[PDB]
Amino acid sequence: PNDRITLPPANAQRTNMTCHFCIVGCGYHVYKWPELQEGGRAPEQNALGLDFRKQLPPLAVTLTPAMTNVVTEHNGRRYNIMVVPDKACVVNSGLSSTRGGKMASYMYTPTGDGKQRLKAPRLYAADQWVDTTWDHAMALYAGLIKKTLDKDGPQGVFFSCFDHGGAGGGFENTWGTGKLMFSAIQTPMVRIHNRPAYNSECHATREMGIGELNNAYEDAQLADVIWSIGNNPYESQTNYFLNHWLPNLQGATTSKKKERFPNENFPQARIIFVDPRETPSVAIARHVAGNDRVLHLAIEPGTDTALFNGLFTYVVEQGWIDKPFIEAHTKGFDDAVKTNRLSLDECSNITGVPVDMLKRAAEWSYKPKASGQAPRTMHAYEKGIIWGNDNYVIQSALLDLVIATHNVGRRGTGCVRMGGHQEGYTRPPYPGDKKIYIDQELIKGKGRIMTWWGCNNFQTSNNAQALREAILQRSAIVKQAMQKARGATTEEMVDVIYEATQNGGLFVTSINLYPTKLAEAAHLMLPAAHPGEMNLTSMNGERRIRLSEKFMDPPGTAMADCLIAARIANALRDMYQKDGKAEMAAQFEGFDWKTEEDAFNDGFRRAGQPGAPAIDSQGGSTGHLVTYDRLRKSGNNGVQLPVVSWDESKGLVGTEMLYTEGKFDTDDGKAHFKPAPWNGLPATVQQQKDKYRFWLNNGRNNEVWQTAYHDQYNSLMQERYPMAYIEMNPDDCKQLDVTGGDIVEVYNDFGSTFAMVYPVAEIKRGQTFMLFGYVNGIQGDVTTDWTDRNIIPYYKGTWGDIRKVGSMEEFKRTVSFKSRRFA
Amino acid sequence: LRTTLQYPATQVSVAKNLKANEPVSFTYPDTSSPCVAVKLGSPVPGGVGPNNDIVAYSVLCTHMGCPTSYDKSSKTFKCPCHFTEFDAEKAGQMICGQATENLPRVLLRYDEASDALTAVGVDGLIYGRQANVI
Ligand SMILES: Nc1nc2c(c(=O)[nH]1)N[C@H]1C(S)=C(S)[C@@H](COP(=O)(O)OP(=O)(O)OC[C@H]3O[C@@H](n4cnc5c(=O)[nH]c(N)nc54)[C@H](O)[C@@H]3O)O[C@H]1N2
Ligand SMILES: Nc1nc2c(c(=O)[nH]1)N[C@H]1C(S)=C(S)[C@@H](COP(=O)(O)OP(=O)(O)OC[C@H]3O[C@@H](n4cnc5c(=O)[nH]c(N)nc54)[C@H](O)[C@@H]3O)O[C@H]1N2
Ligand code: F3S
Ligand code: FES
Ligand SMILES: [Mo]
């Protein structure tokens, strides 16, 4: 029934849960109680402490049927669950996004949205999917890795693996997988879930001395100006935008600024968006702040470097920089002024932004306030520039502007990633000295075995159509070779598969919650466990580490990813010991793990400690002060890393903001300016633009999480977004004789995919915006292979033509094509 | 014993009194639950009245319960608190926003003999209640 909910009893079990999904890492409670019990409506007779004897006032609660479920544990007993935001958590103050609010619905139940969860190992036995045992899966998987190591070495063993936090990442899981891949197998043939080499989104800012998560969310409350660069934060970092940015724009934080800085003017806060596209976030900012307090710099696609070099050149010419800061704490300023020189007239001609708007941006952001201090300008950026036209060069340009204007290390500032997932990285060093484009290697026929581990690059690779076509073809050779087998031992089957991989085959493994589109190619799938079926640690976009507590069993024999890594490492160790190879066996030592906590102890808590191997950790050398029991005591507020101190009396004490003493992460402790050449669009992308009509912009929808791995089973989400949509200018729609709920083909030299038309008045003629990564119409087919110096793709950098397929009468009947820009 | 809530039957008005796209405020199923009925002017699935175009909704946002306002130009309900928007033409479908429930539909009976519109139930859970009927 849809018209009531079962209240948690006053004495219901309550555990802490960070949201599974975005960077913000909102705090939740999980209430769990026997199915046949319920709380009373009186506030002291239910666990929420809310009075259901009468209508609740607005903002009292976030509670819907989607926020409840009934789980069945391995002992067959049934429990109510209720997953609701924590009012006292500093991150979200009781807010829940549409994505975190669905967490109860996306917990595993045999009958709900999680019915299709992987529950057992699955094997494609040449011509059919069947169940197999864990010992058989391990004998095949480890058998193939061992044979490849013994004949080809580690270069024959390929991974694409999460490196992120939250669900399908975090400190336990990045450690287990990194120890396995890098210490034990020692393969350099590793890409990351969102980028096709072992690299960083933030090489330039890190090299300049500025780690990308350098402030606190509170800094968004203290800013005079917030820049949002290549970022749609209402949709993609909702509760950071809603709980910290908007209160600033509304004037609710002005008294906090004045209390902290008694002798400083604080004008009404203003906001600047650098985005070719007019987004829901721009519309909401204008609604809240007024048009006069929002600047939308609607740049030409790929012209970020020209924008920042113009602004840099202008603030230097105006003397709107911090000369003492530059002299004491920086290197390379005079060189950067020469190499990055660009007039406002040139800047305007390249970006298409009028000179008066470039000047106003700089006047709001950098020109001294009446009281003499520089504006506190927080510079936030995300995939519009991280996947923009030369990732390294755009950060080079932007950090130069930020460093010259001292917008790192002062409260209310920062030049930060908004983030994607949560963060939770602890791993051994990458074991080579080479950047390797793993997708291109697979397409060219390299590798014997490829494991997708908590990712689905069938939906999310750049140039995705070339990838899927090569992997399906290489998979089919293995499937064809497995056909002749009758009563084959595991050993024999390992040889049959290896032989097929000598004839251009590839054995594919997926380690996942669900089959996904990967099952079209995979030979073996292994079932994983998400937070709440396991303990998990991760940090948000202000480095705030929290423990998500286990409160239920995973489906069937689903296992935490760190324990799957342990299982693989122990299988290989046993094989090498049996085969009389004591030196190879020793590479697979150190995985004697019974629980995910053991991976937390072995990785995060050993970083920098005496006797420990080399470890790269977001926790740093004080990570050992964190324990599960200490995080439990901290609650959903956790601690901002790095931890400065722990005692029983004060708990974990953390770090709010980095670089507050102007000591940067460089050889000389100074921030380093960098040259930022303006080279135009990459030639590969410019060839598509010269040939085809539309800019194929792409990214997030507020309602859809990533590759829709849970959402694809959600009846409400499938009603709303039955197919990937492409925002189109209405005049462009008329010229193509298309309207809301028509299907189009989108195509260029790289590939061809499909979307449902979504006319959007705000889209520019010749520009579009397609939902990325989706289960019906994969956007990435039309993205190019072009990457920057460090193999970061220009995912936002592609052009194609649009052809009407036809009217999908059922989309027109059932799907809203109304504006998603709030007026 | 019973599995259904005891919904009142609440007279709203007669269909012919409603003007195209001009919202009528009423409470249902008690005085703490504000609702809107609107004759949309063109048929929609599960519209009622002579022209199958009369719909009604709880106006409390299903995110955190701020009263939504009906926008006549878009035939949507817009939440001023965190900007959720619901389509009055698609059974309260959330266009964009932070809710995890479509805007609750008030079930209207249209009686041809009398021209009477009566609120007789609710599809979905009204904000800030354990059950639609307190
Ligand atoms: N064109 C285009 N392409 C893009 C982007 C873009 O802007 N444009 N964005 C890029 C970016 S920023 C990203 S983050 C990538 C995302 O690309 P992917 O990482 O491929 O996509 P996700 O949906 O995050 O993948 C998570 C997968 O792990 C599974 N899973 C979930 N929880 C767990 C768990 O606990 N364990 C395991 N083992 N599996 C789990 C899910 O079912 C799902 O298949 O896509 C990239 N691709
Ligand atoms: N609702 C929701 N939220 C999510 C996710 C999700 O799937 N759904 N995924 C999470 C993850 S993994 C990520 S990485 C983040 C991403 O968060 P964001 O990076 O904010 O989101 P995107 O929609 O990928 O792209 C941001 C903006 O880049 C703009 N853009 C495109 N080309 C350019 C360009 O050349 N220059 C500039 N300046 N801007 C450009 C686009 O118009 C778009 O509005 O969101 C996270 N949060
Ligand atoms: S509810 Fe979840 S999806 Fe992000 S805005 Fe909060 S961490
Ligand atoms: S209360 Fe309506 S959008 Fe949050
Ligand atoms: Mo991402």
Author numbering:
A (entry chain A): 3 to 825
B (entry chain B): 0 to 133
What is the paper's account of this structure, in its own sentences?
Arsenite oxidase (Aio) is an ancient bioenergetic enzyme present in microbes since the early stages of life on Earth, with its origin dated prior to the evolutionary split of Archaea and Bacteria. Aio belongs to the dimethyl sulfoxide reductase family of molybdopterin (Moco)-dependent enzymes, with the Mo atom coordinated by two molybdopterin guanine dinucleotides (MGD). The large subunit, AioA, contains the catalytic Moco and one [3Fe-4S] cluster, while the smaller subunit, AioB, harbors a Rieske [2Fe-2S] cluster.
In this structure, the Mo is pentacoordinated and the As and Mo ions are 3.3 Å apart, in agreement with NT-26 Aio-As EXAFS data. In Af Aio-As_c, the As atom is not apical to Mo and the Mo-O-As bond is not linear but bent (about 140°) with the AsO3 group slightly over the MGD-P dithiolene. Considering the DFT calculations, the intermediate structure (C) (Af Aio-As_c) is not present along the mechanism and, thus, we have interpreted it as a side product and/or a dead-end structure.
